[PDB]
Design a protein around this ligand. Sequence first.
Ligand SMILES: *CC(=O)Nc1ccc(-c2nc3ccccn3c2Nc2c(C)cccc2Cl)cc1
Ligand SMILES: *CC(=O)Nc1ccc(-c2nc3ccccn3c2Nc2c(C)cccc2Cl)cc1
Ligand SMILES: [Ca+2]
Ligand SMILES: [Ca+2]
Ligand SMILES: [Ca+2]
Ligand SMILES: [Ca+2]
Ligand SMILES: [Ca+2]
Ligand SMILES: [Ca+2]
Ligand SMILES: [Cl-]
Ligand SMILES: [Cl-]
Lengths: 236, 236, 5, 5
Amino acid sequence: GAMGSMERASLIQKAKLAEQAERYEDMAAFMKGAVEKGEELSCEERNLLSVAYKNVVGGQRAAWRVLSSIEQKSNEEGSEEKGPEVREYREKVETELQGVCDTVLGLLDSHLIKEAGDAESRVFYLKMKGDYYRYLAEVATGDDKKRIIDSARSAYQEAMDISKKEMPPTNPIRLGLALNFSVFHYEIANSPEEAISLAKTTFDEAMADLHTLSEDSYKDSTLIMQLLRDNLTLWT
Amino acid sequence: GAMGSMERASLIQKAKLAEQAERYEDMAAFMKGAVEKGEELSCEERNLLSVAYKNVVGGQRAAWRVLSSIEQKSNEEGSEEKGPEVREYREKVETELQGVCDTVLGLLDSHLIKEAGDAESRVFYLKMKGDYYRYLAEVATGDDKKRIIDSARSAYQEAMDISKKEMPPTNPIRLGLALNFSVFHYEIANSPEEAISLAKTTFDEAMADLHTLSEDSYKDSTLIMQLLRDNLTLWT
Amino acid sequence: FPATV
Amino acid sequence: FPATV
Ligand SMILES: *CC(=O)Nc1ccc(-c2nc3ccccn3c2Nc2c(C)cccc2Cl)cc1
Ligand SMILES: *CC(=O)Nc1ccc(-c2nc3ccccn3c2Nc2c(C)cccc2Cl)cc1
Ligand SMILES: [Ca+2]
Ligand SMILES: [Ca+2]
Ligand SMILES: [Ca+2]
Ligand SMILES: [Ca+2]
Ligand SMILES: [Ca+2]
Ligand SMILES: [Ca+2]
Ligand SMILES: [Cl-]
Ligand SMILES: [Cl-]
């Protein structure tokens, strides 16, 4: 694409500069270019990819929520008609958000997932696939909403199955997958009991494995375990 | 342009939604479209225009400073050669920043300034012209740098002359103009004494006029006066 | 909103 | 950096 003429290593270097400068759209474009070189991504590079797009879509999701809330208020009884503008602009933001999700899902399908054989890579990418279908589900209101939800579910479930077989219960990728799948259950699938069960079982199995870890690994795992606890506290 | 088919009022409404959603690039594009309708801007609309572009260029300036600092470090003795990437990416951000500045200066020249006859509008737009030439000066390193600096100076000076004749010393536009012109002197023109003199005289003349104001006007004026004081404290 | 990573 | 508005 636009990044076709830039060296892979230069794209990676510039993604890191973009991160330092908090230029996440640039970072994402650099990492898209790197993926399109066709080589597999290292661990560091996978995390650059995920950071970039998470920040871009995160901003779009926050904006969408603002606009949706305004739109909902406009449609209450007693609200003065303001014309089509709120809907139009929410739709604009929504369409851009869907585009970013489609771009990420496209990179995963062409061809990151199919070349990912190690558990750490494959689970990472399947978690991403679940996440970006979850973002699509957040804004879905039509005939395909069930199918979008099921696509998220299926990706998370495959990641979960691999992670349970191939990773220790304290592995940060495994933990973060479970955190997010739990939120999927609560917020998307209308399954709060499943969400709570998953978060609690994940926490407790991780706590039992902390004894095996170095100081630095312990720090990494306990950080995510605290997020599980934070959600459990929100939900109970 | 791209906004040619949207109603002026709809552009303004959407700029306000974009602000609520912290979508400043969208806000700026909406307000550019509104300006290009060719009608003068009200006070509220002028402030929408300025907020939008200030936030966009502010982000670009912060990113530029990060990248310039990295570039400067790369050029120190003992620094390992990293190739052209840091320079390239700083240049990319710089070019986009220059483009935004040129866009704003273009709106002012075609035709906001020439139609602005009231002091509050004319001073506001000339202050903007000074500000965006100042941003261009921050990144200027070539043959035109002196001319860019002089363009900022000239715009600020015209605004200053009108403001002193036509506005009270507590007028927020007058105060904010003086604040920014003072920073121009300190940071761009290598004139710290002029910067300090201007900030102090502006503060003291405003303090002497506060007695004429309502509670709400007093709040507005004293907020900006505190910024003058903050700079004076930084500089002395 | 709940925490995700 | 100094304050501007
Ligand atoms: C190779 C690999 O992906 N390794 C790895 C391990 C941990 C994380 C990670 N660490 C922390 C700490 C606090 C908050 C979030 N994270 C993450 N993020 C993350 C991601 C991007 C994917 C899956 C799980 C987790 Cl926890 C990144 C990468
Ligand atoms: C019509 C008009 O422009 N009126 C007006 C008055 C004050 C301000 C203003 N108020 C405050 C308060 C705190 C910080 C900044 N500001 C500003 N910003 C500002 C601008 C955008 C231009 C000139 C001066 C000032 Cl102070 C905006 C508009
Ligand atoms: Ca190559
Ligand atoms: Ca839609
Ligand atoms: Ca492989
Ligand atoms: Ca019209
Ligand atoms: Ca340049
Ligand atoms: Ca006029
Ligand atoms: Cl729109
Ligand atoms: Cl570049």
